[PDB]
Design a protein around this ligand. Structure first.
Ligand code: CLA
Ligand code: CLA
Ligand code: CLA
Ligand code: CLA
Ligand code: CLA
Ligand code: CLA
Ligand code: CLA
Ligand code: CLA
Ligand code: CLA
Ligand SMILES: CC1=C(/C=C/C(C)=C/C=C/C(C)=C/C=C/C=C(C)/C=C/C=C(C)/C=C/C2=C(C)CCCC2(C)C)C(C)(C)CCC1
Ligand code: SF4
Lengths: 39, 80, 732, 143, 91, 33, 31, 60, 163
């Protein structure tokens, strides 16, 4: 499990997880609050 | 012909001489470094300018330097 | 071995075809020639300058001669809005009969080219009227060219050879150039405008045979000598004046009306005369600044040595910079090219918005061609300015002689300068491209109201401060009770405010979000081209990858594959990379100029205002839409006069593509290929009876970069010139 | 040690020929000869392409370039543990002995050699190019 | 042995005549005598360059002034349709 | 145009005769030993 | 009003003289 | 000068100019560049060691 | 800039009407209650809400009938356009300083490890998450580093090429 979590901590896996989180957050914000142009 | 000048940072590792594909370089006795030898460039008329010697050199900055000069049949690597 | 590169024994002993190419490419690098001295270098440059001046005057003579001989200048003078100006005649034996018929235009008896250079409007404005006038001017300029050639030969003779110290006398040259070459020339031009051009604009035929008989002003020179100078501004040409005739004309010779002549849509000639007179006085005064042989005047070395801030913020300041500039021809050429190229851009920006020649603003093809021509010339010149700055740093810069001054100090924080240029380029590129792509996606998804359209309120505020009331900012010249308003109200403000508040001219065009986006694209281009050029100049002497780069010179192929690989490491290669970015930048600038003006000339400003905020708008509504007449210049149904531009359009695409071969494929592939070819010729019967003198070899690494860049640039320019001229002239 | 003489009676390796060999340059400018003594008959790769069979005993091979001779010599020394000699041959019949120049390979330090191209400084101590303007020198490395 | 120092450098360097054969008698005497006197003035490189220059330049200007008219090149007939019409009422 | 025959003479001269002379002479100069 | 034949010949002759001066300058610059 | 003491490189053409390395050894036979220095970073050739003169290094 | 509020712009209203009309023209080829009908009606509802929201935000509209943003901080604050660029500027700069400070903190913390390069491509994920949480207070810490003199490395410790 230690070796597996080290693999999950390699740069592309962390990049995949973080960018999936960020893209999903942006997508769900735009789903819940459609068409934001201004604050 | 290309000019190959040697500087005094040379540690006498002979790697540039081994790298040379046209036998421009050779090791001569010296007292400036621990290896008691220094690279020399007696046959720059045969130098093609490939800079394999500079790629081989370990000193920072380089101890062998190739300055590309006037081109000849030998330096252009022509077989015709 | 041979004797062609007689200035280079190293090239002369080269047994390959490289000797010919390099012999051509190094012929004007006089400093690197065999046995050259500083004095002989300066003398050779002086004579070469005479040769260039003679070439320029011959070129102008040829334009005048071909218009006088084969053009339609008197017919154009009769109807300047309805006659296409003729450049020269066509004698091409490859023409078919439909091509002979198609190119017969402008009332000519044969096939001709229609001019895009604006010489008709210029020559008509300055008072030329007949073919005889143009012919006499051309003969005069041919004689001037012969005189320049003789002077170039003469100052190469030993008793007329100027000494090296004569070339380094900076103070006398600056005094004379400012006072005479600028000031007296401007004064003489005011004389021409007052005696000839202004009377000819008022229907008065004034030439060499009667100008001593003709009064330029009814009161003569008494108001000038008495100081009652406002007499010459009384009674200007009225707003109903017809150019070239006496109807509605005045008698003023020096005015400050501002704005445009209503009929010609160009600047008033009396304003131009007063401009050049004031310029003459200012420049003649400025030419008395520096000390020569009379005990008065400034010494430039002491001026430079005096300007060091006492707090030490600039180190040694400008100390020693006189000898740095005066001893380096590359510093001087870099300064000259930077200033001249910036001035060329200024000419482009001011001639479209303040047209100085009668019936130029209505000639849309000519205005577009002139703007594009001068902006591309300016871009090439700016690249050269930075190139010769880099060459100065390699060849001429002495660190000991510049210890602690501004030059050494800017070298000492080159990483800060380069990194900040990198940051601004990155910011502009990321955000300009991002806003464009966001708008493209908004248009694609059917929701243009979701676009990000930032109003250019800063430039609109500037336009308001100069009197444009459209945006509602009430300040300065758009505020009727301001001090700035009241000061100009009786002199130049009525004409200026009439011109700047009219949308029927090019004076301070209405701008919006499309102008915002493209201006930030222009900023990205300027900053990135500058980044490449500045990094090339500051790293020209060495970098961490190659700390002894100054020992290898300005231009060299690489330093080999060692240390990670070092392709394009020389400062020359930074020039080569920056030319691509300059061409890209001038392309964006000229695309913007042409598309905005196409909408304005066709009377539909909404096309630019709505489509330029996204890149599909540029592609579809500018490139695709306006290429239709051009590519139909010849088709299966026949051909018309746009067929030359269709052919040149394709010609430029082909030359551009051929450049990619030299830029993408590199040397060693071709050298091995040429080796097999050299084997084939020696082994082929009846062909091996003939032999080469020079051993065929592949082009060198640097030569390939040059030749690829030349094909790329030539194809770029030829393609855009064909598209610009065909698209504008097929409609107008 | 004295420089050896090129023995022209030496046999050549067994080769079927190729298009990669000598051209007109060998007739009018120069060509090169590599000689070596093989311990046994075996196949080697020609620097001009193709397999050849070296004969047992002395071998002689004519080649267009010095680099070709040194490439074959590198192969002979590293794959077959065999030493060799390289000559330059001129159209007038002159034969110049090239390698190893003093009988010892250049990578091995040998007494009697004198340094040429040596600079008694580090490379960062070279002067500026402005200091060699109008002197005729090749560069800052030349002084 | 494919090498020899002297008297066989031609074979060593492969300087062979693969197809050229020594032969003095190929053409008839009267035919040859005719063609040597025909091409005699052009056996000097300056005379042939002068002859080809003068003939070629004269043929080219004679073509341009007269010959192009005789073969009715379209550039010599000129237009007959009155001129192409431009937009905006321009001529 | 006046002297309208001149293009039919000068265009072949500048386009064919002068370039042939120029490249022949320049070839002879740049190959001269 | 068009130019005359004589005017064209005058211009061509003056240009020929200028070209002779140009050849002179070019040869002087060469050697 | 000492074994394993930090030194700052003063050779301008060196990749590690103004940087701090570790002295490996100092040759005592009077050679031109006796101070062997090891660095935590590789240069462009992948090398981490270089030899310097006494005046080319400053003890830190 | 001579603009008009989008809530009183005729071009804005025409654009809303035209977009709704195109979507409604697509609607009359599907039965009611079908998935395409529901999707098109949802798009129509979103379009109407979007045009209402852009009108109600006080956005200015050009002659194109499209919203134009005001970015001068003076014109934005006095005329109620701070939500267009100024407040987004503050929000972006806060998040960007957060990201940069978290990256700098992670790099500095990794510099003291025995194998500093290992943490650059094999991420210490608990440490990265802890540092990422602490980036919320970045302006205070960064301003203190600026005044203290520890934000910047001294020029004598940074390599430079020969000049
Ligand atoms: C990691 C990014 C991320 C974040 C912050 C959210 C956040 C949310 N999702 Mg979402 N989701 C994501 C990625 C994410 N989702 C991905 C990759 C999928 C598969 C494509 C979904 C599929 C999904 C569905 C099917 C639903 C949510 C719902 C929700 C909401 C309640 C849980 C919340 C706003 C629920 C909802 O919309 O609100 C109740 C809901 O029904 N999500
Ligand atoms: C309070 C009094 C005062 C003030 C405000 C100044 C101000 C100035 N003096 Mg001093 N001066 C004073 C008193 C003063 N002076 C007195 C009493 C004397 C004795 C008579 C002098 C004698 C003196 C001399 C002899 C000189 C000055 C000069 C200067 C200038 C530069 C000084 C400097 O160190 O720049 C520091 C500048 C830098 C360190 C470089 C900054 C570069 C920036 C960062 C580049 C940014 C580029 C940008 C990003 C790109 C474009 C931006 C884009 C938006 C367009 C500056 C205008 C010099 C001069 O310039 O004269 C005109 C000069 O030669 N002064
Ligand atoms: C007043 C303008 C002016 C003058 C007097 C010079 C003068 C010179 N230049 Mg600079 N330059 C200029 C403008 C100028 N240039 C412009 C507008 C550019 C941008 C394109 C440059 C970019 C430039 C570079 C990159 C280089 C020079 C070089 C040279 C030198 C040799 C030129 C040569 O032999 O070319 C021969 C030209 C040809 C055979 C034709 C080339 C193909 C054309 C475009 C067709 C000479 C000192 C060279 C130098 O000084 O080496 C250190 C050099 O490398 N110039
Ligand atoms: C369309 C062509 C193009 C593009 C986009 C670029 C882009 C760039 N050039 Mg290169 N250039 C080009 C053509 C181009 N160049 C050509 C033909 C040459 C001649 C060889 C050069 C020569 C050149 C030089 C010599 C220099 C540049 C520099 C730059 C940068 C300018 C600053 C900037 O705009 O940052 C913004 C960056 C961009 C616009 C790049 C694209 C960014 C993308 C869109 C980000 C998003 C990526 C996406 C999310 C990832 C998806 C991946 C997917 C697989 C998951 C930028 C990286 C300069 C530089 O490096 O300064 C820092 C520099 O010195 N260029
Ligand atoms: C640099 C200026 C320049 C340029 C680009 C041209 C270009 C042209 N000329 Mg015009 N020419 C010029 C100057 C120029 N001319 C001047 C000043 C005169 C008055 C003497 C003429 C007199 C002239 C005649 C009489 C004719 C042309 C013709 C032509 C065309 C074919 C070329 C030819 O046959 O020339 C031949 C011209 C000469 C032999 C004399 C002029 C030679 C110039 C001055 C050399 C300039 C060299 C330049 C500065 C550096 C290179 C072509 C459009 C022909 C034509 O119009 O076709 C339709 C034709 O019949 N030219
Ligand atoms: C300005 C340069 C120029 C000029 C004036 C011409 C003129 C001509 N070309 Mg075009 N050509 C040129 C450049 C030029 N060429 C270039 C650069 C290319 C390559 C892109 C071509 C490719 C080309 C092709 C492929 C063909 C032409 C042909 C023609 C002829 C068409 C008219 C006709 O019907 O003749 C009919 C022909 C005759 C009535 C016989 C004319 C014989 C001449 C007068 C012989 C002159 C002697 C000669 C020049 C000696 C040279 C000596 C020395 C100067 C070297 C005409 C002679 C066509 C052809 O007819 O020519 C063979 C043809 O097939 N050209
Ligand atoms: C503004 C235009 C201009 C000026 C003022 C000069 C000035 C000069 N050049 Mg440069 N040249 C130009 C344009 C120019 N050239 C162009 C467009 C090219 C092609 C890219 C060249 C290529 C070139 C070469 C290859 C050489 C010069 C040389 C010279 C010098 C003597 C010229 C001469 O007439 O010798 C007259 C000599 C003869 C007629 C017999 C020898 C033939 C020479 C070696 C070649 C022809 C040179 C001539 C300028 C080519 C014209 C090119 C044409 C397409 C315009 C002089 C300093 C020569 C010099 O020695 O270097 C300093 C030299 O070798 N030039
Ligand atoms: C790129 C920098 C820049 C530029 C060119 C402008 C331009 C402008 N501002 Mg803005 N501004 C900026 C940055 C800028 N601003 C920043 C950073 C702030 C926050 C400190 C402001 C805060 C601000 C206020 C509070 C006001 C302006 C005002 C103005 C206008 C008149 C200013 C003036 O000089 O009157 C002389 C003018 C359009 C005025 C405006 O709102 O109405 C005209 C005004 O009251 N600005
Ligand atoms: C720790 C992350 C970090 C920080 C604090 C900086 C800071 C800086 N960068 Mg550097 N950069 C980074 C990562 C970082 N960069 C990476 C990963 C790359 C390769 C793509 C670059 C490539 C780069 C270039 C090419 C340039 C800068 C420049 C700059 C400066 C101006 C700001 C800027 O231009 O942003 C722009 C930043 C980018 C375009 C890349 C940012 C990529 C992400 C968003 C940052 C990395 C986040 C990191 C993975 C977080 C991990 C932390 C976590 C484990 C806790 C500033 C010194 C510019 C300059 O030098 O100004 C003077 C400049 O020209 N950067
Ligand atoms: C590298 C180098 C070099 C080069 C450089 C260059 C190339 C540069 C460029 C530069 C540039 C290109 C610049 C420009 C600038 C400009 C400016 C600076 C301007 C200013 C302006 C102003 C100040 C104005 C004002 C005004 C007025 C007057 C009126 C109203 C409006 C206004 C306000 C705007 C040299 C040679 C030196 C040396 C060596 C190095
Ligand atoms: S450049 Fe190549 S041929 Fe010349 S000395 Fe170095 S390794 Fe030998």
């Amino acid at each position: 499990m230690k070796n597996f979590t080290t693999y999950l901590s390699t740069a592309p896996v962390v990049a995949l997880i973080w960018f999936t989180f960020t893209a999903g957050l942006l997508i769900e914000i735009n789903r819940f609050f459609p068409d934001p142009l201004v604050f | 012909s290309h000019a190959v000048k040697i500087y005094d940072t040379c540690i006498g590792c002979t790697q540039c001489v081994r790298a040379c594909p046209t036998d421009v370089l050779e090791m001569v006795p010296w007292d400036g470094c621990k290896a008691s030898q220094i690279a020399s460039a007696p046959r720059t008329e045969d130098c093609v300018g490939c800079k394999r010697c500079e790629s081989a050199c370990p000193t920072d900055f380089l101890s062998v330097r190739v300055y590309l000069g006037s081109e000849t049949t030998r330096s252009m690597g022509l077989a015709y | 071995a041979t004797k062609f590169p007689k200035f280079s024994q190293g090239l002369a002993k080269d047994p390959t075809t490289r000797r010919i190419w390099y012999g051509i490419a190094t012929a004007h690098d006089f400093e690197s020639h065999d046995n050259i001295t500083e004095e002989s270098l300066y003398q050779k440059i002086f004579a070469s300058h005479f040769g260039q001046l003679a070439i320029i005057f011959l070129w102008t003579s040829g334009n005048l001669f071909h218009v006088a001989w084969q053009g339609n200048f008197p017919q154009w003078v009769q109807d300047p809005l309805h006659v296409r100006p003729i450049a020269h005649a066509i004698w091409d034996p490859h023409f078919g009969q439909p091509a002979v018929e198609a190119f017969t235009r402008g009332g000519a008896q044969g096939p001709v080219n229609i001019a895009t250079s604006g010489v008709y409007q210029w020559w008509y404005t300055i008072g030329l009227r007949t073919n005889q006038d143009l012919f006499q001017g051309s003969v005069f300029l041919t004689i001037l060219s012969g005189l320049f050639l003789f002077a170039g030969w003469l100052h190469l003779q030993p008793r007329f050879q100027p000494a090296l110290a004569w070339f380094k006398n900076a103070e006398s040259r600056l005094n004379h150039h400012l006072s005479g070459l600028f000031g007296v020339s401007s004064l003489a031009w005011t004389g021409h405008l007052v005696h000839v051009a202004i009377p000819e604009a008022r229907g008065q035929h004034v030439r060499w045979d009667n100008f001593l008989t003709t009064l330029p002003h009814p009161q003569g020179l008494a108001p000038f000598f008495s100081g009652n100078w406002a007499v010459y501004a009384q009674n200007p040409d009225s707003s109903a004046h017809l150019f070239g005739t006496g109807e509605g004309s005045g008698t003023a010779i020096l005015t400050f009306l501002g704005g445009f002549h209503p009929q010609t849509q160009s600047l008033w000639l009396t304003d131009i005369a007063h401009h050049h007179l004031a310029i003459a006085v200012v420049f003649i005064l400025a030419g008395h600044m520096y000390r020569t042989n009379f005990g008065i005047g400034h010494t430039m070395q002491e001026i430079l040595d005096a300007h060091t801030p006492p707090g030490g913020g600039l180190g040694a300041g400008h100390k020693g910079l006189f000898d740095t500039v005066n001893n380096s021809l590359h510093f001087q050429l870099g300064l000259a090219l930077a200033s001249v190229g910036t001035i060329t851009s200024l000419v482009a920006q001011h001639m479209y918005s303040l047209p100085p020649y009668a019936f130029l603003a209505q000639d849309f093809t000519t205005q577009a061609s002139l703007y594009t021509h001068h902006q591309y010339i300016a871009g090439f010149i700016l690249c050269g300015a930075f190139a010769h700055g880099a060459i100065f740093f390699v060849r001429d810069y002495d660190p000991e002689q510049n210890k602690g001054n501004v030059l050494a100090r800017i070298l000492d924080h080159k990483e800060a300068v380069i990194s900040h240029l990198s940051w601004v380029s990155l910011f502009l590129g990321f955000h300009t491209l991002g806003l464009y792509v966001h708008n493209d996606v908004m248009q694609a998804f059917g929701t243009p109201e979701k676009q990000i359209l930032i109003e250019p309120v800063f430039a609109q505020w500037i336009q308001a401060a100069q009197g444009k009331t459209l945006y509602g900012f009430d300040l300065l010249l758009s505020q009727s009770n301001s001090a700035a308003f009241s000061a100009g109200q009786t002199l130049w403000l009525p004409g200026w405010l009439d011109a700047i508040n009219s949308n029927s001219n090019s004076l301070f065009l209405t701008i919006g979000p499309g102008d915002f986006l493209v201006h930030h694209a222009i900023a990205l281009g300027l900053h990135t081209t500058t980044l490449i050029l500045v990094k090339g100049a500051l790293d020209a002497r060495g970098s961490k990858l190659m700390p002894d780069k100054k020992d290898f010179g300005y231009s060299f192929p690489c330093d080999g594959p060692g240390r990670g690989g070092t392709c394009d490491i020389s400062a020359w290669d930074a020039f080569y990379l920056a030319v691509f970015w300059m061409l890209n930048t001038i392309g964006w600038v000229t695309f913007y100029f042409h598309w905005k003006h196409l909408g304005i000339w066709q009377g539909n400003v909404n096309q630019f205002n709505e489509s330029s905020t996204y890149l599909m708008g540029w592609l579809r509504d500018y490139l695709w839409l306006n290429s239709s007449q051009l590519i139909n210049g010849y088709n299966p149904f026949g051909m018309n006069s746009l067929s030359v531009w269709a052919w040149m359009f394709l010609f430029g695409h082909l030359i551009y593509a051929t450049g990619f071969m030299f830029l993408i494929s590199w040397r060693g592939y071709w050298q091995e290929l040429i080796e097999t070819l050299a084997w084939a010729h020696e082994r082929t019967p009846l062909a091996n009876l003939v032999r080469w003198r020079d051993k065929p070899v592949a082009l060198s690494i640097v030569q390939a970069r040059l030749v690829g860049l030349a094909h790329f640039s030539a194809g770029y320019i030829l393609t855009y010139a064909a598209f610009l001229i065909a698209s504008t002239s097929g409609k107008f | 040690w004295k420089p050896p003489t090129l023995d022209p009676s030496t046999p050549s390796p067994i080769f079927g020929g190729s298009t990669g060999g000598l051209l007109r340059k060998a007739q009018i400018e120069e060509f090169y000869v590599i000689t070596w003594d093989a311990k046994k008959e075996q196949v080697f790769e020609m620097p001009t392409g193709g397999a050849a069979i070296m004969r047992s005993g002395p071998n002689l091979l004519k080649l267009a370039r010095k680099e070709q001779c040194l490439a074959l010599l590198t192969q002979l020394r590293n794959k077959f543990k065999t030493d060799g000699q390289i000559y330059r041959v001129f159209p007038d019949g002159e034969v110049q002995y090239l390698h190893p120049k003093d009988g010892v390979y250049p990578e091995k330090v040998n007494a009697g050699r004198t340094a040429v191209g040596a600079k008694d400084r580090s490379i960062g101590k070279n002067t500026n190019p402005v200091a060699v303007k109008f002197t005729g020198k090749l560069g800052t490395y030349d002084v | 042995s494919e090498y020899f120092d002297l008297d066989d450098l031609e074979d060593t360097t492969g300087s062979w005549e693969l197809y050229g054969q020594e032969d003095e008698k190929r053409y008839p005497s009267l035919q040859a005598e005719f063609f040597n006197r025909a091409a005699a003035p052009l056996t000097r490189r300056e005379s042939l360059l002068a002859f080809t220059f003068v003939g070629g330049a004269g043929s080219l200007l004679l073509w341009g002034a007269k010959g192009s008219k005789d073969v009715a090149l379209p550039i010599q007939q000129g237009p007959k349709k009155g001129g192409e019409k431009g937009p905006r009422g321009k001529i | 145009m006046a002297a309208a025959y001149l293009p039919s003479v000068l265009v072949p001269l500048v386009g064919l005769v002068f370039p042939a002379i120029a490249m022949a002479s320049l070839f002879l100069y740049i190959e001269k030993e | 009003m068009p130019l005359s034949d004589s005017q064209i010949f005058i211009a061509l002759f003056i240009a020929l003289l200028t070209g002779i001066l140009a050849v002179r300058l070019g040869l002087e610059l060469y050697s | 000068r000492l074994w394993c003491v930090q030194v700052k490189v003063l050779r301008p053409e060196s990749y590690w100019f103004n940087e701090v390395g570790k002295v490996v050894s100092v040759d005592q036979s009077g050679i031109r560049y006796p101070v062997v220095v090891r660095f935590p970073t590789v240069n462009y050739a992948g090398v981490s060691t270089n030899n310097y003169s006494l005046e080319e290094v400053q003890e830190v | 800039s001579g603009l008009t509020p989008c809530s009183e712009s005729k071009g804005f209203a025409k654009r809303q009407k035209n977009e709704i009309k195109a979507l409604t023209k697509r609607l009359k080829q599907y039965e009611e209650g079908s998935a395409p009908s529901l999707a098109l009606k949802a798009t129509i509802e979103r379009t109407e809400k979007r045009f209402a929201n852009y009108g109600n935000a006080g956005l200015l509209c050009g002659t194109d009938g499209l919203p134009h943003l005001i970015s001068d901080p003076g014109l934005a604050l006095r005329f109620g356009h701070a939500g267009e660029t100024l407040i987004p500027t503050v929000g972006f700069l806060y998040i960007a300083g957060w990201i940069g400070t978290a990256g700098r903190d992670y790099l500095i913390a990794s510099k003291g490890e025995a194998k500093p390069r290992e943490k650059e491509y094999i991420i210490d994920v608990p440490l990265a998450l802890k540092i990422s949480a602490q980036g919320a207070g970045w302006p205070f810490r960064v301003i203190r580093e600026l005044q203290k003199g520890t934000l910047l490395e001294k020029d004598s410790n940074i390599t430079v090429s020969p000049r």
